[PDB]
Amino acid sequence: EPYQIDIRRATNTDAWGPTPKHLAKVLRNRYQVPLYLMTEYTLKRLVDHINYGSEWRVVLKCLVVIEFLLLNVDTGDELNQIRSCLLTHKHILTREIAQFKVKFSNDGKMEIHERGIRKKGELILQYLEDSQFLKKERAKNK
């Protein structure tokens, strides 16, 4: 499906991204695709990825996509779907991401990337456990 294509593009193995253009395209799928399914697909791609030194990028980018959606979808239905999906699969964050090891990266900076992944995982858990924090960060974001 197009939303899956968009998410795949935004979470590719290139050494930069996802770009604002990538993210805006993902977001636009909400017009016809439930946010639950968009989130679920992103989580599926994440778990699947848990050139060897580039694979971790998919992991970090999936988390960035989840963060972006949390910050950018509308209150009500869209936000609630993302949150339900994440809560249902919460172990992905509390165990798989919290314990994720970047064994090898092409840039030799494995530790920075591993910290980045785990911090993004922590941040998502904070948003989920503290809706007032998410609200504040959604406001800062505009």
Method by which the model was determined: X-ray
Instruction: Read off the CATH number of the domain in which 9 is found.
Output: 1.25.40.90
Which of these, 21, 30, 66, 29, lies nearest to 46 by C-alpha position? 66
The tally of domains found in the chain comes to 1
A 10 A CB-CB count for 23 gives 19
Q: What is the resolution of this structure in A?
A: 2.1
Provide the residue range defining the domain that includes 108: 1-142
| Distance, CA of 7 to CA of 23 (rounded, Å) | 8
Angle between helices 56-72 and 77-88 (to 10 degrees): 140
Quick one: how far is CA 26 from the chain centroid?
Answer: 12
Phi, psi (rounded to 5 degrees) for 32? -130, -5
